[PDB]
Design a protein around this ligand. Structure first.
Ligand SMILES: *C(=O)N[C@H](CC(=O)O)C(=O)O
Ligand SMILES: *C(=O)N[C@H](CC(=O)O)C(=O)O
Ligand SMILES: [Cl-]
Lengths: 226, 230, 226, 229
């Protein structure tokens, strides 16, 4: 009763135990300030097109997985409004490049929970019953209840999407993989500030027989999802 | 002369550590996974067919940094990737992948059971071997924090700054750097003191650190570190 | 420049390093359903006076520590409204005793975040800049950002207050102590609905030369606080 | 009529809650049965406490251990202790131990107190591990803190934990609380634990039972061995 998705370097999940009850989609950090028109990344002159590219592929995967009753998880990078969870080095770096965490930005206080720019874009917005993780780090496990939630949901397989490929998505994939989760990265459903770094982060997954999991794409996933 | 207790290492994209609070008592070198298994002739990496020269290149630069930091009384930490001999800490997917490529964790190899604690090939290479008082972390994951006492030890030592070296750049070194950075540690990657299975991935992992004003920390090299280390 | 509070079994903190910048008060779980008139605990016929007794002593300690600029932290036990963070055993036990988590109670859904009964009582309500931890467990560290926050605040010493002495306060003290925090339990600022269990939890702290820290009272704290 | 649900008579509810009791999903944990905690010349003896209270659980544990080994249950052991360079030793923990005359790392009759690799730190011969039984080396009172215990339980797919060992109110209770918060279903065997003060042992057990079994449920060696599938 095994089911696989075509993937590189191996068909995923490794053991073919692919079911709605044991598999989650995670959509990482698809937040207005990071990928929306008029947010701080846009206003700062970064190559926003590369982080907007995955929106439509993610929307298709999200719709397909919702329709088949898979677990859906979302994450948002951000800080408590009093900045109690903000490391000093993280703050200092953000100030130095002109996007100081907690400082006023075009869509509210930058990377601050409760602010408009911090929230998930409307095109990928969560619905009731979809867990949202609020993460103070780049990895979604650090200082959150993500692992507790995955354990109570009995999730074994995670399909990763979102931004950026080399920062938050890679970090979360690496954390999950170390703990024994079986992870699939959808290459057309992620993007980064630097396309080369996006491509390299993907390549890194595949080495050593799939050191962090396996890699596929939205079409292959939607076509073969049970 | 005007003297300061703030000290920096020339680094990219910013002089490191960010606040200049660089002292023996608050700074550690970490040497990641310099094991016969990752960089010597008969280990898991060798078994997978990779070019050992890429992962041996950092040995001499690491040794120079290690000697300098030992001499000035900095904290020194070492890590080893590996599993309990009964494999109780080995995820099924990790095991399966290693078997599929012909380097099964726990399977017999030329230097003992692959990636298995207590086996000859699993140990740190003699030229970078720990000495007394240097904490060794035994990690079942690619990130040295997961399921270990690394964080507990860093906290009791009051370490604020970490200088990262070892292998591989894109797997264990990058993962550990990311974990440390998320928790607030201030991290410096020494680019000539790491290496990978694929040189492009090594270079990209280094570039990833520098983006967004040093998203994971900053990057320097052994010569610049040794020259400016207080 | 050492300062100590009279305490049993040793004057606290052990090294006398007692300052506003390195010391936090934590007020654990002073929530309406647990200690308020008409909450679920009151309706079940527990002796609410035992969990109300700490309110006035806590108020005194809180006022003194606020005035001197110490760190103040609050905790609330509770679950996400979709119950994604709720272990099945925890749920089952709560149902069996007629106080099912997420079920309708006299002050809203029991132990559910955002419900009236779940919030902190008005007499001990947080003010801006006082971090609130929302905990799905009895120990306030599990699956939260408490440790991350303590680390960024450079907190070394923790003064524990709140309820219940033997469940959430003891668990949090044990977690903190294992990580190296230096903890003071204020015996008149905690309570449990079984007074014997309260007394025993306190005794447990003191054994082996203060195995979990030391124990004092609100008057001794306020008198000697620097 | 047969069922694959199985329960152990326990207080306040029959355990495990859902009757899903199998060798593959259930572990015994034996906490800190070390010469340091229950032997002459160890840490606990140095602090003046009565060793009979912490030796009492030895024979009941031995019986449970034998029964669970014979039926192929997972067996886990823990040892409280520190790296020999004391890198994992909080300063307050050390200071307290010195103040009462049982300093961690200090020389004792059975080697350096609470120090990994020393004779006094090892598990007593009567309850010694065998191959395939995971041993956790814990720098804290709770066996989860800074260890791989949770990773191991997750890879073994363990759902149910039966707790034994010493002391009831310190290491056993702490580990039970940690496990319970994460969703593990825990049974404390009251005759298979003991403490420095019998009243504190009894109270730690009572604390488990309140609020419908806030930390799990409680039974005894005879009831467990009689009903273990
Ligand atoms: C996680 O990766 N979050 C942000 C988004 C950005 O466009 O800067 C990041 O990249 O680190
Ligand atoms: C932490 O102790 N929370 C509650 C309060 C109650 O009165 O029932 C608990 O005891 O579990
Ligand atoms: Cl200075």
């Amino acid at each position: 009763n095994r089911h696989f998705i075509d993937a590189d370097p191996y068909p995923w999940p490794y053991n073919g135990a692919l079911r709605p009850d044991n598999t989650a989609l995670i959509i990482i950090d698809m937040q207005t300030d990071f990928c929306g028109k008029g947010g701080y990344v846009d206003h700062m002159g970064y190559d926003l097109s590369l982080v907007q590219a995955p929106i439509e592929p993610i929307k298709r995967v999200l719709a397909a997985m919702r329709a088949k009753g898979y677990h859906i998880i979302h994450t948002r990078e951000g800080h408590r409004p009093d900045l109690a969870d903000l490391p000093a080095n993280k703050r200092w770096r953000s100030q130095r490049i002109g996007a100081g965490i907690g400082d006023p930005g075009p869509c509210g206080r930058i990377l601050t929970r409760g602010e408009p720019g911090w929230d998930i874009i409307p095109e990928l917005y969560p619905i009731e019953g979809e867990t949202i993780i609020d993460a103070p780090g780049k990895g979604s496990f650090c200082a959150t209840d993500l692992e507790l939630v995955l354990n109570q949901k009995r999730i074994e397989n995670i399909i990763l999407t979102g931004i950026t490929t080399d920062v938050c998505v890679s970090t979360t994939m690496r954390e999950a993989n170390d703990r024994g989760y079986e992870c699939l990265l959808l290459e057309d459903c992620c993007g980064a500030t630097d396309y080369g770094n996006h491509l390299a982060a993907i390549k890194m997954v595949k080495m050593q027989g799939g050191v962090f999991g396996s890699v596929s794409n939205s079409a292959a996933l939607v076509e073969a999802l049970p």
